[PDB]
Short mmCIF file of C-alpha atoms in Angstrom, two decimals:
data_model
loop_
_atom_site.label_atom_id
_atom_site.label_comp_id
_atom_site.label_asym_id
_atom_site.label_seq_id
_atom_site.Cartn_x
_atom_site.Cartn_y
_atom_site.Cartn_z
CA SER A 1 95.58 107.01 15.16
CA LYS A 2 93.36 104.08 16.12
CA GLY A 3 95.07 103.94 19.52
CA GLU A 4 93.44 107.25 20.44
CA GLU A 5 90.04 105.51 20.58
CA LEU A 6 91.29 103.50 23.57
CA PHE A 7 91.53 106.68 25.68
CA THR A 8 88.16 108.40 25.28
CA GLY A 9 87.10 107.24 28.74
CA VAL A 10 88.65 106.51 32.12
CA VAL A 11 91.07 103.58 31.91
CA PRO A 12 92.32 101.49 34.87
CA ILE A 13 96.09 101.52 35.42
CA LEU A 14 98.43 98.96 36.94
CA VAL A 15 102.04 99.89 37.75
CA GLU A 16 104.59 97.26 38.80
CA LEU A 17 108.17 98.27 39.59
CA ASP A 18 111.06 96.04 40.64
CA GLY A 19 114.09 97.98 41.79
CA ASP A 20 117.69 97.50 42.80
CA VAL A 21 119.43 100.60 44.17
CA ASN A 22 123.01 100.00 45.35
CA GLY A 23 122.03 96.34 45.76
CA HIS A 24 118.88 97.18 47.77
CA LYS A 25 116.04 95.17 46.25
CA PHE A 26 112.53 96.57 46.51
CA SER A 27 109.19 96.43 44.75
CA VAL A 28 106.36 98.90 44.20
CA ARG A 29 102.80 98.21 43.06
CA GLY A 30 100.44 100.97 41.99
CA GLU A 31 96.77 100.94 41.05
CA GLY A 32 94.46 103.67 39.82
CA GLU A 33 93.08 105.19 36.65
CA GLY A 34 93.76 107.74 33.95
CA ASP A 35 91.62 110.00 31.79
CA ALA A 36 93.37 111.37 28.72
CA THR A 37 90.39 113.65 28.03
CA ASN A 38 91.50 115.90 30.89
CA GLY A 39 95.04 114.51 31.28
CA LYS A 40 94.27 113.43 34.85
CA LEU A 41 95.91 110.46 36.61
CA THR A 42 95.01 109.22 40.11
CA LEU A 43 97.01 106.35 41.60
CA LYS A 44 98.08 104.87 44.90
CA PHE A 45 101.49 103.18 45.14
CA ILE A 46 102.63 100.83 47.90
CA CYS A 47 106.11 99.51 48.61
CA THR A 48 105.47 95.77 48.86
CA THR A 49 108.88 94.91 50.36
CA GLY A 50 108.83 97.20 53.43
CA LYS A 51 110.17 100.75 53.60
CA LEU A 52 110.94 102.33 50.23
CA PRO A 53 114.75 102.67 50.32
CA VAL A 54 114.75 105.79 48.10
CA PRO A 55 112.45 108.86 48.39
CA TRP A 56 109.01 108.47 46.81
CA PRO A 57 109.42 111.74 44.83
CA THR A 58 112.42 110.30 43.01
CA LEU A 59 110.21 107.55 41.50
CA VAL A 60 107.35 109.74 40.18
CA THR A 61 108.67 110.11 36.63
CA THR A 62 109.38 106.36 36.42
CA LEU A 63 105.99 105.28 37.83
CA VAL A 64 102.22 106.59 31.50
CA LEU A 65 102.46 109.50 29.05
CA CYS A 66 99.72 107.92 26.90
CA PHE A 67 97.32 109.68 29.33
CA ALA A 68 98.55 113.16 28.34
CA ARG A 69 95.78 115.45 27.08
CA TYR A 70 96.67 116.36 23.50
CA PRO A 71 94.49 119.24 22.22
CA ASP A 72 92.58 118.48 19.03
CA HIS A 73 94.98 120.39 16.80
CA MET A 74 97.93 118.39 18.21
CA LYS A 75 96.44 114.88 18.06
CA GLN A 76 98.60 114.09 15.01
CA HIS A 77 101.66 114.42 17.30
CA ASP A 78 100.63 111.90 19.99
CA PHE A 79 103.19 109.13 19.65
CA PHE A 80 102.18 107.54 22.94
CA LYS A 81 98.60 106.70 22.08
CA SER A 82 99.53 105.83 18.50
CA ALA A 83 101.70 102.94 19.77
CA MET A 84 98.69 101.42 21.61
CA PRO A 85 97.45 98.85 22.36
CA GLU A 86 100.68 96.95 21.59
CA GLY A 87 102.48 99.67 23.52
CA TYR A 88 105.98 101.04 23.77
CA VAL A 89 109.25 100.59 25.63
CA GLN A 90 110.26 103.59 27.75
CA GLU A 91 113.91 103.78 28.82
CA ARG A 92 115.56 106.43 30.97
CA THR A 93 118.81 107.39 32.59
CA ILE A 94 118.20 109.69 35.57
CA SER A 95 121.33 111.38 36.92
CA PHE A 96 121.06 112.87 40.42
CA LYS A 97 123.47 115.78 40.70
CA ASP A 98 126.35 115.03 43.09
CA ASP A 99 124.92 111.53 43.65
CA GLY A 100 124.06 108.31 41.84
CA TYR A 101 121.85 107.50 38.90
CA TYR A 102 118.86 105.39 37.92
CA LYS A 103 118.55 103.29 34.79
CA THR A 104 114.99 102.28 33.97
CA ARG A 105 113.39 100.03 31.37
CA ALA A 106 109.60 99.93 31.19
CA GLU A 107 106.92 98.43 28.99
CA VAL A 108 103.67 100.41 28.72
CA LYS A 109 100.85 98.49 27.06
CA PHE A 110 97.30 97.22 27.44
CA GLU A 111 96.87 93.87 29.21
CA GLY A 112 93.18 93.21 28.78
CA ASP A 113 91.30 96.38 29.65
CA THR A 114 94.10 97.74 31.88
CA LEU A 115 96.96 100.03 30.90
CA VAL A 116 100.03 98.45 32.50
CA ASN A 117 103.39 100.08 33.23
CA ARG A 118 105.94 97.38 34.12
CA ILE A 119 109.35 98.72 35.15
CA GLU A 120 112.80 97.39 35.98
CA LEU A 121 114.90 99.99 37.80
CA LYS A 122 118.60 99.91 38.68
CA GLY A 123 120.26 102.55 40.84
CA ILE A 124 124.02 102.73 41.29
CA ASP A 125 126.72 104.91 42.84
CA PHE A 126 124.39 106.45 45.42
CA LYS A 127 126.09 108.14 48.36
CA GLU A 128 125.79 107.13 51.94
CA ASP A 129 124.02 109.95 53.80
CA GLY A 130 123.15 111.66 50.51
CA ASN A 131 119.71 113.04 49.71
CA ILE A 132 118.53 109.79 48.13
CA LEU A 133 119.68 106.99 50.43
CA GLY A 134 119.35 109.36 53.38
CA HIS A 135 115.75 110.32 52.49
CA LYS A 136 116.38 114.06 52.71
CA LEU A 137 113.93 115.16 50.03
CA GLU A 138 110.68 116.95 50.82
CA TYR A 139 107.48 115.05 50.10
CA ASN A 140 106.23 117.32 47.34
CA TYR A 141 106.69 117.82 43.63
CA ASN A 142 107.29 120.78 41.35
CA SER A 143 105.64 121.47 38.02
CA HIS A 144 107.85 120.72 35.03
CA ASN A 145 107.97 120.79 31.24
CA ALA A 146 109.35 117.87 29.27
CA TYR A 147 110.09 118.66 25.63
CA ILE A 148 109.43 115.80 23.19
CA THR A 149 111.30 115.30 19.92
CA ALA A 150 110.95 112.72 17.19
CA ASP A 151 113.62 110.03 16.87
CA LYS A 152 113.04 108.91 13.28
CA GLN A 153 116.01 106.52 13.31
CA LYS A 154 114.38 104.56 16.16
CA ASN A 155 110.77 105.09 14.97
CA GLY A 156 110.17 106.65 18.37
CA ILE A 157 110.64 109.76 20.51
CA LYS A 158 113.30 111.18 22.81
CA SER A 159 113.20 113.66 25.66
CA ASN A 160 115.67 115.34 27.99
CA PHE A 161 114.50 117.25 31.05
CA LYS A 162 115.51 118.15 34.59
CA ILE A 163 113.41 117.54 37.70
CA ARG A 164 113.90 119.82 40.70
CA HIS A 165 113.57 117.89 43.96
CA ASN A 166 113.33 120.13 47.02
CA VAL A 167 115.76 119.16 49.81
CA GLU A 168 114.63 119.68 53.39
CA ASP A 169 117.42 122.23 53.98
CA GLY A 170 116.01 124.47 51.22
CA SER A 171 118.51 123.38 48.57
CA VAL A 172 117.45 121.69 45.33
CA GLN A 173 118.49 118.22 44.15
CA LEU A 174 118.49 118.12 40.35
CA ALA A 175 117.61 114.89 38.53
CA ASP A 176 118.67 114.96 34.87
CA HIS A 177 116.46 112.68 32.77
CA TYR A 178 117.37 111.26 29.36
CA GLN A 179 114.45 109.35 27.86
CA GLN A 180 113.79 107.29 24.74
CA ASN A 181 110.57 105.56 23.67
CA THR A 182 110.19 102.96 20.93
CA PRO A 183 107.04 101.11 19.82
CA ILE A 184 106.64 97.46 20.71
CA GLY A 185 104.56 96.65 17.62
CA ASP A 186 105.32 97.06 13.93
CA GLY A 187 102.26 99.13 13.01
CA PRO A 188 102.42 102.79 12.02
CA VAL A 189 103.05 105.33 14.77
CA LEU A 190 102.79 109.11 14.89
CA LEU A 191 106.19 110.82 14.96
CA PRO A 192 105.66 114.30 16.39
CA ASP A 193 106.84 117.77 15.66
CA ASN A 194 108.69 119.34 18.58
CA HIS A 195 106.38 120.08 21.51
CA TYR A 196 106.27 119.65 25.25
CA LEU A 197 104.34 118.01 28.04
CA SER A 198 103.39 120.18 31.00
CA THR A 199 103.06 118.08 34.15
CA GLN A 200 101.81 118.89 37.64
CA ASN A 201 101.74 116.49 40.58
CA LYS A 202 100.18 116.38 44.06
CA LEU A 203 101.61 113.84 46.52
CA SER A 204 99.58 112.85 49.57
CA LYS A 205 99.05 110.03 52.05
CA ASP A 206 96.19 107.65 52.77
CA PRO A 207 95.43 108.13 56.50
CA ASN A 208 94.38 104.47 56.84
CA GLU A 209 97.38 102.96 55.02
CA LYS A 210 100.02 101.38 57.25
CA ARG A 211 102.44 100.43 54.47
CA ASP A 212 104.94 102.86 52.97
CA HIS A 213 102.97 104.41 50.15
CA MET A 214 102.31 107.41 47.93
CA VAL A 215 98.97 108.80 46.75
CA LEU A 216 99.52 110.63 43.46
CA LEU A 217 97.36 113.00 41.44
CA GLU A 218 98.90 114.11 38.15
CA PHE A 219 97.87 116.37 35.27
CA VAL A 220 99.70 116.02 31.96
CA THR A 221 98.92 118.40 29.09
CA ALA A 222 100.55 118.58 25.66
CA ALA A 223 101.43 122.06 24.45
CA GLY A 224 103.77 124.02 22.23
CA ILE A 225 102.04 123.69 18.84
CA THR A 226 99.50 126.45 18.24
CA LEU A 227 96.72 126.93 15.72
#
């Protein structure tokens, strides 16, 4: 994988999201940096259209798996870096239990020296006074595993996983993710054996930021293939 050479140091990240949830149009811009050598991402996201009309935690998975730390013995299974710099398309359906769903289409690729994640998001069938449109989710994030499988027929990867979002009444709002990734270029990519990504997230606020925003620190580590 030549693409791996692009991630030996810290790389600046740009995230641009345009969204439409039940007809609500909104935009998010994020800026920060990622270091695949320790799997660490640090970004700040701002809603550029006013108040974010869905909860920030529900956008974390949508807002760059090429920064996952793959241990040396697993580097042959790193589809995400192998697709670089031309990049890959990442598509998801995210089903919120007892509520609506997101459909997302993103391109992840290098634009100059910056790794860019550009996303179109559509949300439909969300409930009035539900946990999403009513902003009833806690501002926090649980640790999760996302298992990755090869999708040979699409020359890409697939993944299905559930996110637990804590509700402020102590209940949990499940978000069922179905993901597929396909390379943008025609060059060879690494199709992996089964494995998983272990992800942790810390959400915070910038005390000097007056816009609706999210400060995010994320660790992503590949696992599940031993020596």
